[PDB]
Specification:
This is part of a larger assembly, with chains A (272 residues) and B (49 residues). In chain A, 2% of the residues lie in helices and 16% in strands. Chain A is mainly β. The longest helix of chain B has 13 residues, at 25-37. Classes of the chains: A mainly beta (272), B mainly alpha (49). The chains hardly touch. Bound molecules: magnesium ion (MG) (128 copies). One magnesium ion is lined by residues 31, 35 of chain A. Chain A binds seven RNA strands through strand 1, strand 2, strand 3, strand 9 and helix 1. The PDB classes it as ribosome. The entry lists the keywords Protein biosynthesis, ribosome, RNA, tRNA, transfer RNA, 30S, 70S, 16S, 23S, ribosomal subunit.
Chain lengths: 272, 49
RNA sequence: GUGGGAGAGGGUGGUGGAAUUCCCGGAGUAGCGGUGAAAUGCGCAGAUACCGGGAGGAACGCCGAUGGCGAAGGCAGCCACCUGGUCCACCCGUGACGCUGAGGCGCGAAAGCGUGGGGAGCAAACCGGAUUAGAUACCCGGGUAGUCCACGCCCUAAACG
RNA sequence: CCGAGGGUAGGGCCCGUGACUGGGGCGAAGUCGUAACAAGGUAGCUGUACCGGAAGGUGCGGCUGGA
RNA sequence: CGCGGGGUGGAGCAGCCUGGUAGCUCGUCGGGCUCAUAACCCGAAGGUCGUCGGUUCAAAUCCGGCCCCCGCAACCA
RNA sequence: GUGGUUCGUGGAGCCAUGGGGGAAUCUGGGCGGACCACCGCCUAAGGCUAAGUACUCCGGGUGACCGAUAGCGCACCAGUA
RNA sequence: CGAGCUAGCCCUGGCCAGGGUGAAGCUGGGGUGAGACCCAGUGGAGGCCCGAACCGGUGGGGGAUGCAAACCCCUCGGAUG
RNA sequence: CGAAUGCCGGCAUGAGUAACGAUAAAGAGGGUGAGAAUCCCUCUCGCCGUAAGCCCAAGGGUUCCUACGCAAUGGUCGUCAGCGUAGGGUUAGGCGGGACCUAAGGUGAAGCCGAAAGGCGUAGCCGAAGGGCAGCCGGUUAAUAUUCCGGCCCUUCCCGCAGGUGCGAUGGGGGGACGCUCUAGGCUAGGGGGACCGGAGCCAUGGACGAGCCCGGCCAGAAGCGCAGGGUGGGAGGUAGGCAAAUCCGCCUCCCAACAAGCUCUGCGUGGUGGGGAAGCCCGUACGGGUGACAACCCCCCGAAGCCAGGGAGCCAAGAAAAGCCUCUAAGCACAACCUGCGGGAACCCGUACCGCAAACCGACACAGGUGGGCGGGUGCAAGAGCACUCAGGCGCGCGGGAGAACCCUCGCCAAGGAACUCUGCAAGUUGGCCCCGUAACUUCGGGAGAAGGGGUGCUCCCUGGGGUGAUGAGCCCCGGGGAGCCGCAGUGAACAGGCUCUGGCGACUGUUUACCAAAAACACAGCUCUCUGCGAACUCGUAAGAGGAGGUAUAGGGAGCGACGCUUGCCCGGUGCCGGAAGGUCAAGGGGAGGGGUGCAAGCCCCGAACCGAAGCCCCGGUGAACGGCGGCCGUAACUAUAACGGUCCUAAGGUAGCGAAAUUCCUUGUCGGGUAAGUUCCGACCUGCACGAAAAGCGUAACGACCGGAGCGCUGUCUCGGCGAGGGACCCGGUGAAAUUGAACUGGCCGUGAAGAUGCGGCCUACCCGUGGCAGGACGAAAAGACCCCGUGGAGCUUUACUGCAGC
RNA sequence: UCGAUGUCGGCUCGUCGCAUCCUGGGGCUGAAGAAGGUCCCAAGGGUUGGGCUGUUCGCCCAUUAAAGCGGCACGCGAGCU
């Protein structure tokens, strides 16, 4: 989708909005299973650690289910599909037959009315979740766990997905939304299908405000400020850095790798 | 234009208050000295009810 | 109409080996590549040559033919689904409802453009090596848009019988 | 009231004109290379796209006006 | 005015700083191949080294004086 | 690796130690300025211990000390206005 | 010791007269094979428009031991973000 | 002590000078009084009036009220006061705060961390203009009142009786409970009219004894009705989730509704009864009191932004929590308890005065400044919180009187010209609101656009079509059209109310910034691109524990540059940086001991110490520029001259492409040619010889936007020729109060000399009676600041880097 | 003169020198006349309006009897911009 606009105001011409057709007549969220008071704040205890944040629409947290072995075997019916301000993926709310309700990040396909479930059993269909081993090599899938019982963590962004590649001992090779081939443990669930609402990468914010709404204040270039507060700074009419591009704190930012070398997680990785 | 003193009872006891100064090691010393110097008033005289 | 027939005609989805390139494991050295001849180039940090495993993309050998189909462009591994045209027999039905077609309207290789994906081989531009008086070329080694896909544009051709 | 004509103002069309610039034509015997015609010494021609002092080159696809 | 760089056969460049020995590409001349010109092949010629001085036995080469040439600085007021 | 000592790595011991190795019970251990030999001195890794020394919010004495611009910031309702 | 000025941010409350302009989406009619699309009427968008409060502080002028250690008059910018 | 721009204190000078804090404005009579422009009174006048009037909040803390008072405080006066002395004055179960709750944030048992002091921290507490929660209207005081009193109306507790029910939790669930903008229906507040009703009155000056002028025609109100609207389905089986249990909730499943039909709950009428009550006239106030009055206390019309409120429609950025309240159960208990009536008793603490856009708060001051929320009437102007006048209510701004010079400020007008003014139309003018005609290039199809340029605009009569409320009608009120005619110089007759265009530069655009000299072409910005980060992420803070990132997960997050959009972004990896290289070469600790030394008679004990093995870094090998950067010189050549498509040669890592170019970059320079002018160092279009453009420190464009900057034309003008008058506030004069910086001391003249080279002061001559007031600024190297540039001092700070040396971090 | 002497231009107000731009007088002329050249005497008065530039300055435009050079802290900021 992606709503468009006629130019009746510069900016609201290039501006592009999402299409909330996929939003089952829902909107008002569900008390109980979410929401919780969401403590918004751009800095830690005192100081500001991440810069340029703050401001932007008030938000309510939708406490989603990111570990599904909670209900192994208990099937549930997908009730609605709603908007979640805390993420890029739309989310689906679903009523188990157990009578319990919980939200799930909604996969592309999954339609309201559908029945979905989790566990070793589970049929390989959009929405169902199973330990990685039991999933057919090659099938795509989202909401992966990295270590058994620790909760989903990979491919959860709007319309992202990972594809299974092979098996190898108690591990199974994956291919993350980034292109890295990772070795994940067999016992990590991963609900099947891709995340959906993949038009998300196409929304043209539009104006200055639009960014402000999502809570992101203006970002000033180092080049603009002085030597006192950033490498690229001073002296006359602009300047060409004058040294290898660096961050406010001073480490190179055009090429310098960061992953800490001797990490134990190294051996389970294979790509880029 | 607007100036720098905008009186506020709450802020004043809340900041230069007595329990305020007792709470920290530096403030307790603030008291010591003032006590040791004589000062009729150890801390500002906030008021009302 | 009834009943049959051929076909790479169109769309969508799914799928099979062959080979190429990269990757790792093996084992093996002293050269491989390349041309008219050579050099660039690749290689004792282990190349080329062989075995095994893996990834991925594109094109689909033999069948293939001077063949079939399509209105033109064009269309080829294999499977299913949805679909158009089309020839035959039976002479059953309507009963002149026909031809053409300014304009409009859709279609329309390749290259090009847009936003997103993909990217193996090839490959403008470009980089070296030869060749020449000089080569911005023909040859050689590299190599990016592109070629591939989705939606959207563009409307050209020796769109040629 | 209307009203020739006059006046204010903005458009349409058409002709002359202008530093300078893009191409085109013509101008017996100036410069540079040789692309085409013989297989033209790289078959050519092409729509197109990039590049080159210039003819041009090369990329993708088509054609016989060639093998 | 000041700083440093440079004048070499016809053209463009080496040659010095560690003084004795001028080298390269082109061009020019004679000869070949071609019907002829170019290419290509065979041979040959050409340099008071910007000038006036001395330094040494000996100066393109070391050192001062001028003749042009090129580049850099001419700031605070 | 360092601190302490006069000791700034110096021939740098002794006394404290963060790190790592890691003993012995008198024929056992330390020290006497690298080290070794004699010759000597001491007995580490538990603790307590008066008096002699410091100071002066406070009390009394004395001043070749001040005398209200001095002497404490204040002689006086000052850490006050 | 200070964020009772000022800068950001967090929590929770308020404020924005009155006018213009009229997006999408609807409904209707046109159109077609079904469309795209076109008309109306409707609707009421927007870091839109005019301009008070409210927030600024553009040009000039006065003030310059001032009314004022930044002020006054005229004039001007934003004014549902 | 004579000087230190010395310290402290006192007193001079300027000086009776400048001032007396908004140009809203005063006059007179009468009082009082020792003494009035300045106090009381009254009469007249002027100012505000979406306030300069009321009402809350903060803050202030006696300022409130009374009497008695002027020495000081008042910018003069003062009998007055916000001042001095003293006495009084602030009434609450219902308004606000607490014995209710929770947000950020604080705190903090547990837990963790830290040389110490301390840092962190789920549970619990605290934290308020948020949620919850029971009061309306009048009367009284010199001063308080939703507090006192009157009428009416509510709330919890406790103890009784009288009934009902399994009652019962800090535990389960429900609810409370939420954005923006646009909105409906009906109400209320509030406002207009009235021939009707109620009133003391009044014919003024030529007319009017009249549906005449004037004044007012309400307010609260329990139950119960009535009119609006808000909420919510009822049964019944089945259950494995709501961390125990539930009959409640959730989820299947059948019934009946699908409606508000029924319960509720709000507000809004009406309601027993209760209270108000104008002008004007009489009074005595500092003010209110009495008559009016047995007051009347009714019909329409406008109507909210407020109420019904958890109303609805849309949209995207997707919009607190906890308690009260309802229900469900556990222990316990079921002679308890809790529910509904009904009585009777109990209801604490603190705030209440007054100021509160201001003389009581913030600004040293009775300071033209600043300060959150609510009410803010009428008329006309298209509308309004705009504007002009005026309600109620509050004011005339705590120095006056005259004068009527210069000059200043603020304002008005002007002959002829109209930009000649000037750095520049700077300023001032013109133009302005509304309705209707009519509008270009360009363009991203919206815009440009209020383009431009034009007409209409008052009042009277006639005729006529729509709405609303009433009933399909009167009235009442809102909108339309036509037709005649009237008067002015002029009809948005006063106030509020764009000058317009053409063409460059820059940045897309709304936005932001140097609080107190810079609002821009600067920052920001959507958008692009590079690059890091697989999650106990990267990165940032912190010694840590921690925390942000993020309760996110590659369509996400950190860093960097460019900056909408269009068309594009060419070459060099030689140096630097980053990336990729299980080879090497070097390389520290440590491994290793060939071998040498010191002592011992010795066994021993003590030092050195070579091969060799030893990382990361570096060297070396590759790659990468939307990484740091860079992107040539000299000669020759065309059948006119000229010039070079062609060539040679030297050096590069490669040798600037497109596109732009005398530019926001052009030194020479006003390059040269065209355009604009009578004339054009600027501007505009060209040319290219680019001192010294050029492709993400982006190149060249661009509709639109702009308090940006340049050029130009129209229009209009006191900008100017070139001034002139007038106005008001000062200046001037008298009375009252009365500063300041400065100052070696002063009996302080010109010329020409002279001197440390710029003389009132030394020289000669010249002039020159003593002392003032208004003026002008040439001088006193006038005042103000131990010069802010310059240099010096082995002075200091901020910044940079392949300067030296450390340090954190890796 | 650095315990401060404000600095280019414009403007307003002027004053002075004369090595005179005009007009007054004159000698010589290669001065027929007219209009010129050139010198000598003479400052008494006059010595314009625009275009461009911050400009001094110059360059032009339309005139003029002429469109003089200089000094006065590149006169003049307790007078202005
Ligand atoms: Mg909730
Ligand atoms: Mg803290
Ligand atoms: Mg930025
Ligand atoms: Mg800066
Ligand atoms: Mg820096
Ligand atoms: Mg038949
Ligand atoms: Mg017939
Ligand atoms: Mg046909
Ligand atoms: Mg096509
Ligand atoms: Mg194609
Ligand atoms: Mg994109
Ligand atoms: Mg290739
Ligand atoms: Mg050749
Ligand atoms: Mg090739
Ligand atoms: Mg053909
Ligand atoms: Mg023309
Ligand atoms: Mg031409
Ligand atoms: Mg030729
Ligand atoms: Mg040829
Ligand atoms: Mg060819
Ligand atoms: Mg081609
Ligand atoms: Mg030491
Ligand atoms: Mg020892
Ligand atoms: Mg000893
Ligand atoms: Mg010894
Ligand atoms: Mg001893
Ligand atoms: Mg002791
Ligand atoms: Mg004393
Ligand atoms: Mg004395
Ligand atoms: Mg519409
Ligand atoms: Mg609107
Ligand atoms: Mg707006
Ligand atoms: Mg300003
Ligand atoms: Mg506005
Ligand atoms: Mg002395
Ligand atoms: Mg003194
Ligand atoms: Mg005086
Ligand atoms: Mg005077
Ligand atoms: Mg005076
Ligand atoms: Mg006054
Ligand atoms: Mg008296
Ligand atoms: Mg008035
Ligand atoms: Mg008092
Ligand atoms: Mg009083
Ligand atoms: Mg009195
Ligand atoms: Mg007085
Ligand atoms: Mg005063
Ligand atoms: Mg008093
Ligand atoms: Mg109590
Ligand atoms: Mg509490
Ligand atoms: Mg609490
Ligand atoms: Mg704490
Ligand atoms: Mg509260
Ligand atoms: Mg209450
Ligand atoms: Mg009162
Ligand atoms: Mg119960
Ligand atoms: Mg409960
Ligand atoms: Mg609850
Ligand atoms: Mg009469
Ligand atoms: Mg009532
Ligand atoms: Mg349970
Ligand atoms: Mg009465
Ligand atoms: Mg609602
Ligand atoms: Mg609680
Ligand atoms: Mg009170
Ligand atoms: Mg009160
Ligand atoms: Mg107010
Ligand atoms: Mg006053
Ligand atoms: Mg005031
Ligand atoms: Mg205000
Ligand atoms: Mg109102
Ligand atoms: Mg109006
Ligand atoms: Mg007003
Ligand atoms: Mg005039
Ligand atoms: Mg006139
Ligand atoms: Mg005119
Ligand atoms: Mg002019
Ligand atoms: Mg002038
Ligand atoms: Mg101008
Ligand atoms: Mg102006
Ligand atoms: Mg302009
Ligand atoms: Mg801008
Ligand atoms: Mg400023
Ligand atoms: Mg500001
Ligand atoms: Mg601005
Ligand atoms: Mg974390
Ligand atoms: Mg912190
Ligand atoms: Mg978080
Ligand atoms: Mg990123
Ligand atoms: Mg930039
Ligand atoms: Mg920029
Ligand atoms: Mg580039
Ligand atoms: Mg490199
Ligand atoms: Mg490079
Ligand atoms: Mg390299
Ligand atoms: Mg490396
Ligand atoms: Mg190494
Ligand atoms: Mg140029
Ligand atoms: Mg001209
Ligand atoms: Mg010109
Ligand atoms: Mg330049
Ligand atoms: Mg540039
Ligand atoms: Mg660049
Ligand atoms: Mg730019
Ligand atoms: Mg702006
Ligand atoms: Mg004037
Ligand atoms: Mg006057
Ligand atoms: Mg006087
Ligand atoms: Mg005298
Ligand atoms: Mg003198
Ligand atoms: Mg004397
Ligand atoms: Mg004298
Ligand atoms: Mg003077
Ligand atoms: Mg001075
Ligand atoms: Mg000094
Ligand atoms: Mg300087
Ligand atoms: Mg030094
Ligand atoms: Mg001096
Ligand atoms: Mg000086
Ligand atoms: Mg002085
Ligand atoms: Mg003569
Ligand atoms: Mg003379
Ligand atoms: Mg002009
Ligand atoms: Mg003069
Ligand atoms: Mg001079
Ligand atoms: Mg000068
Ligand atoms: Mg001067
Ligand atoms: Mg002076």
């Amino acid at each position: 989708a992606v709503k468009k606009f006629k130019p009746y105001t510069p900016s609201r011409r290039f501006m592009t909005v999402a299409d909330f057709s996929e939003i089952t007549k829902t909107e008002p969220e569900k008390s109980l299973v979410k929401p919780l008071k969401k403590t918004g704040g751009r800095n830690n205890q005192g100081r500001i650690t991440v810069r340029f944040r703050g401001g932007g629409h008030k938000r309510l947290y939708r406490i989603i289910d990111f570990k599904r072995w909670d209900k192994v075997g208990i099937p549930a019916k997908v009730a609605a599909i709603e908007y979640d301000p805390n993420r890029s993926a739309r989310i689906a709310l679903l009523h188990y037959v157990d009578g319990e309700k919980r939200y799930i990040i909604a996969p592309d396909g999954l339609q309201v009315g559908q029945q979905v479930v989790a566990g070793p059993d589970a049929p390989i269909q959009v929405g169902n979740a199973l330990p990685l081993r039991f999933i057919p090599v090659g099938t795509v899938v989202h909401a992966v766990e990295l270590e058994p019982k620790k909760g989903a963590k990979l491919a959860r962004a709007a319309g992202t997905s990972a594809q299974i590649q092979g098996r190898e001992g108690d591990y199974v090779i994956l291919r993350l939304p980034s292109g890295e081939l990772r070795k994940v443990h067999g016992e990590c669930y991963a609900t099947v299908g891709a995340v959906g609402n993949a038009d998300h990468k196409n929304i043209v914010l539009g104006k200055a405000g639009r960014s402000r709404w999502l809570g992101r204040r203006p970002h000033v270039r180092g080049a603009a400020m002085n030597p006192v507060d950033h490498p690229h700074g001073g002296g006359e009419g602009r300047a060409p850095r004058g040294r290898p591009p660096a961050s406010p704190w001073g480490w190179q930012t055009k090429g310098l790798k960061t992953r800490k070398r001797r990490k134990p997680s190294s051996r389970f990785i294979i790509a880029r | 234009m607007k100036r720098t003193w905008q009186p506020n009872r709450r802020k004043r006891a809340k900041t230069h208050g007595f329990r305020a100064r007792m709470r920290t090691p530096g403030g307790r010393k603030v008291l010591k000295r003032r006590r040791q110097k004589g000062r009729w008033r150890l801390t500002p005289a906030v008021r009302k009810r």
